[PDB]
Structures are given as C-alpha cells and as structure tokens.
C-alpha cells in the first residue's frame, strides 16, 4: 500500500532509470555502481545506490511490483524503519556478495526483493500474528526465479549472489525478529 518508505522508494528508482534513459546506462553505473577500484572506497552512496539502477523497463516494473507488494505489506503491519533497515542491510549484503561472485557491475531491486521475500515468508510463518505472510504460490515462483537464474535461462544475465545473499538477509532477519516477537 501507500506507505512513505514504499513510495520514496519507487520515486527513487523511476528517477533513476529516466536518469539512466537520457544519459545513458554506462554514465550512471559509472556513479552509482558498487566501487569497481579500492580507491572509490569512500564514496559510500555506492553500497546502496546499485540498488537503485534497473536496465530495462521489465526489470524495474517487475521489482517495483514485488517492492510495492512486499515492501508495502512490511511498511505497513512493522512500520517505517523496519522496511529501511531490512533494505539497506539487504542492499549493502546483496551487493557485497554479488560483488564477490561476479564484479561491480549490477543494479537492480532484486537483491532487495528477495530479502523482503525471505523475510515475509519466514515471518509468517513462524509469527502469524505479524499480519504479513508470502503466498505458497509466491514462495514458489520466487524459487523458480532463482534456479532460473542459475541455469541462465533464456539469455539472462541475472545477479545470482544477490538473490541468494538477499534471501539469506531476510530469512535472517525474520528468524532474529521472530524469537523476539
């Protein structure tokens, strides 16, 4: 729904994209990527801002649906900071790890999403009482959407560590706030 966090959020990236659009993908990545050089070490925006970058207009539809559907749903039954601190720990770890498997150069929601994904599953289940659940239909084809990232389906060239690190952040994160809650 219409939470804060949610929209800004979707405003971020949609400006980002037109960003991309005028100037290009290559301009943007060179400023928003995921330091490619020790030496841009300190320009901080970068752990985040990756996430912030979609390639085409399927990929950001896509992961804003989910973040709107996911996102929303978290914003509203936690509240504001829980859905801030969920993204940026799963931005900057998603990242971290796709850096890892595949270099600096990725952008996307996805990471994320699957963390949102991972947490809302793992939340409703254990903790029911939250308000917020993933569908059996959903959990499902998020575990399509993996494996088919693996077996680089159809011409794909899917950020994989971020799937995985994100899903992982998130079932965390739900484990943690599921033995307090």
Same mark, same amino acid.
């Given at each position: ?13 949609? !400006? ?9 993908? @290559? ?38 649906? #989910? ?6 749903? !978290?914003?509203?039954?936690? $509240? ?18 796709? @850096? ?34 993933? @569908? ?12 088919? $990232? #693996? ?18 952040? $998130? ?11």
């Amino acid at each position: 729904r219409a939470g804060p966090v949610t929209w800004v959020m979707m405003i971020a990236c949609v !400006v980002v994209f037109i960003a991309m659009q005028i100037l290009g993908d @290559q301009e943007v990545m060179l400023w928003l990527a995921w330091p490619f050089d020790p030496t841009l070490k300190f320009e901080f925006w970068r752990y985040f801002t990756h996430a912030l970058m979609h390639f085409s207009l399927m990929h950001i539809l896509f992961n804003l649906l #989910w973040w709107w559907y996911l996102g929303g749903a !978290v914003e509203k039954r936690l $509240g504001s900071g829980k859905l801030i601190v969920i993204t940026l720990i799963s931005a900057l770890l998603s990242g971290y790890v796709q @850096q890892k498997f595949s270099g600096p150069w990725f952008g996307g929601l996805s990471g994320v999403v699957f963390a949102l994904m991972g947490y809302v599953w793992l939340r409703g289940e254990r903790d029911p009482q939250s308000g917020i659940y993933l @569908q059996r239909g959903l959990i499902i084809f998020a575990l399509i959407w993996i494996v088919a $990232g #693996w077996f680089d389906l159809f011409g794909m060239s899917m950020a994989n560590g971020a799937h995985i690190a994100g899903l992982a952040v $998130g079932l965390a994160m739900a484990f943690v706030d599921s033995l307090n809650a």
